[PDB]
């Protein structure tokens with residue numbers, strides 16, 4: 001109970017900032033998460049023994065893939081931590097509990113392949129879940145781990161509170177399906193601009209949490225340039241492996257997934273910043289003004305890709 005987690009001075013300061021990188025020391029990532037739960041939620045939110053056992057079972061169920069790995073899970077949780085800490089009074093007790101867990105679990109048992117590839121391969125998961133295939137699987141894996149003996153971190157919640165928190169987690173994880181992002185952002189854009197956005201309306205909170213999940217999931221574009229640039233290598237290592245697997249099924253992959261078209265990456269990143277990333281953090285900043293540093297960092301990285309195209313790097 002009186003056992004706090006403390007980080008070294010540089011981490012203690014920088015972990016509060018949106019652009020924090022969790023570093024290459026994997027054995028510190030569990031401690032970083034517990035630190036973030038304790039400051040975000042409270043030292044009383046979870047039984048420490050149960051929380052520690054939950055974290056280590058989650059870690060075990062992330063695979064050794066270039067990008068959709070344990071490091072991604074903790075990185076996405078940190079971006080959510082930074083949002084919650086900068087918007088103290090906007091979020092309920094159950095939301096702060098649910099969302100850090102949802103972020104840690106949102107890509108559980110990822111194989112490094114898109115929903116598209118599972119459908120074309122005719123994977124069993126594509127027959128069980130026709131839409132948001134991998135994301136329904138990630139939620140299914142989260143419930144499985146929560147039901148392991150000694151792993152129920154929500155055990156002190158009432159029946160109805162437990163159902164509310166698992167419903168927060170399910171919607172949050174489903175919302176990481178980028179196919180659902182475009183419509184969700186358009187609706188939030190219209191609600192904000194016509195002034196009908198209402199944070200007491202539950203269907204409205206769901207939309208706003210959904211956008212926070214996209215923002216946290218894409219947060220590679222909100223880091224300092226050298227982190228953003230090196231993370232791109234891992235992203236394209238997965239995309240290009242899936243491209244290779246598309247060619248084995250006798251299907252020309254999109255250029256994003258074709259390693260033969262490496263030369264077009266700079267222009268592809270521009271399109272992504274312009275069509276997905278900048279719109280995401282723009283709308284997020286309108287609804288939650290203190291998340292503006294995410295938008296600033298994204299714009300800084302857009303400018304760096306413009307420099308790559310002009311041969312200045």
Ligand SMILES: Cn1ncc(C(=O)NCCO)c1C(=O)Nc1ccn2cc(-c3ccccc3)nc2n1
Pocket residue numbers: 178217218220221227228229231232235255256257261262264265266267268269271272
């Ligand atoms: C889903 N997700 N999550 C993180 C990121 C991300 O990229 N993060 C940068 C990390 O620094 C993405 C992502 O969708 N990126 C995209 C999106 C569309 N693209 C089109 C091309 C392209 C086209 C033609 C040729 C070469 C590439 N490349 C793309 N890359």
Ligand SMILES: [Mg+2]
Pocket residue numbers: 106107134176177
């Ligand atoms: Mg995912």
Ligand SMILES: [Zn+2]
Pocket residue numbers: 072076106107176217
């Ligand atoms: Zn993810």
